């Protein structure tokens, strides 16, 4: 058949399998690309924490955490703790427009994990709370 970019809905039965697992069963890699940090947490389909890594936990400080090299390092460190638990395929759910938004995804690929999907879950309000005032710098 062809190849669709839309995720396979759980209910309807499909033939897309990864190591004999359905899309729902694949573990999830939650990436939080902030402006000054990048936190990564790998969980299973049943919301069981498997691995956690961040630029701060890798020995970076202050303005070194808001770089693409620190996000990649945290991806390699989270792809090494989850690869010991039997993780190969993951579903990325990136949250934020930070520097380590795509660099952490590369680090996960440099750790032995195969990405099957990229989900964006950046918090967007339909006006809710008022942000801080603009700055003069």
């Amino acid at each position: 058949t062809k190849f669709s970019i839309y995720p396979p809905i759980p209910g309807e039965e499909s033939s897309l399998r990864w190591a004999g697992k359905k899309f729902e069963e694949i573990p999830i890699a939650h990436i939080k690309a902030s402006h000054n940090n990048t936190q990564i947490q790998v969980v299973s389909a049943s919301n069981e924490p498997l691995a956690f890594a961040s630029c701060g936990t890798e020995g970076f400080r202050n303005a070194k955490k808001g770089t693409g090299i620190a996000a990649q390092t945290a991806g390699i460190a989270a792809a090494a703790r989850a690869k010991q638990k039997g993780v190969i395929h993951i579903r990325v759910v990136v949250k934020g427009l930070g520097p380590g938004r795509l660099s952490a995804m590369h680090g996960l690929i440099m750790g032995g994990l195969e990405v099957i999907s990229i989900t964006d879950n950046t918090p967007i309000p339909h006006n809710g709370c008022r942000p801080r005032k603009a700055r003069k710098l």
């Binding site: 701060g56 020995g59 390092t73």
Partner: protein, 191 residues
């Protein structure tokens, strides 16, 4: 400014005096051999003592790194020891108006009150001829406003071939203060 946090898997120095999680002295080992023990037991290394010339690093669990700084958060609260002294500077002119001298003399009282060091410099007024007799009479005129609170640390000197005078003030020390107090009472009460 440091924090009791893990250094990571990137070590700058080849040779480290590694320490066990339980406090055992593993002994100096190559940089590569340090990371092998971080994976074998899933532990993070923290630099305990930077000052020593031989590098000292201790490998401990994440929970152990939380209890440590949780105690440095209480010891400093219980017995805080922040003693750095800020240095403030003022550059006056011989012909400075009194109104500006009362505004700048009230600023020195806020600094002195904050245990700061106030370096005051006086320069020859714009196309004004003046000696060091009345040019040094502004310090005594400023110090008089703070009789007991302030005292000289340094004394007027010819910093720039005499065209300028520099002095430094400080908040009166506790002991000195008590001495001043004692003297004040005798002059009026004993009389």
């Amino acid at each position: 400014k440091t924090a009791f946090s893990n250094v990571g898997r990137k070590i700058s120095q080849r040779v480290i005096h590694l320490f066990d999680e339980k406090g055992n002295d593993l002994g100096n080992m190559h940089r590569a051999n340090v990371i092998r023990l971080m994976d074998e037991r899933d532990l993070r290394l923290v630099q305990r003592n930077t000052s020593t010339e031989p590098a000292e690093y201790q490998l401990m669990t994440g929970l152990q790194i939380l209890q440590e700084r949780q105690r440095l958060r209480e010891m400093e609260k219980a017995n805080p020891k922040t003693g750095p002294t800020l240095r403030k500077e003022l550059i006056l002119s011989s012909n400075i108006g009194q109104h500006d001298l009362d505004t700048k003399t009230k600023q020195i009282q806020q600094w002195i009150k904050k245990k700061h060091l106030v370096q005051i410099t006086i320069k020859k007024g714009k196309n004004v001829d003046v000696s060091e007799n009345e040019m040094e009479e502004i310090f005594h005129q400023i110090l008089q406003t703070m009789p007991g609170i302030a005292t000289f640390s340094s004394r007027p000197q010819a910093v720039q071939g005499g065209k300028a005078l520099m002095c430094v003030l400080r908040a009166l020390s506790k002991n000195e203060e008590k001495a001043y107090k004692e003297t004040q009472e005798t002059q009026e009460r004993d009389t």
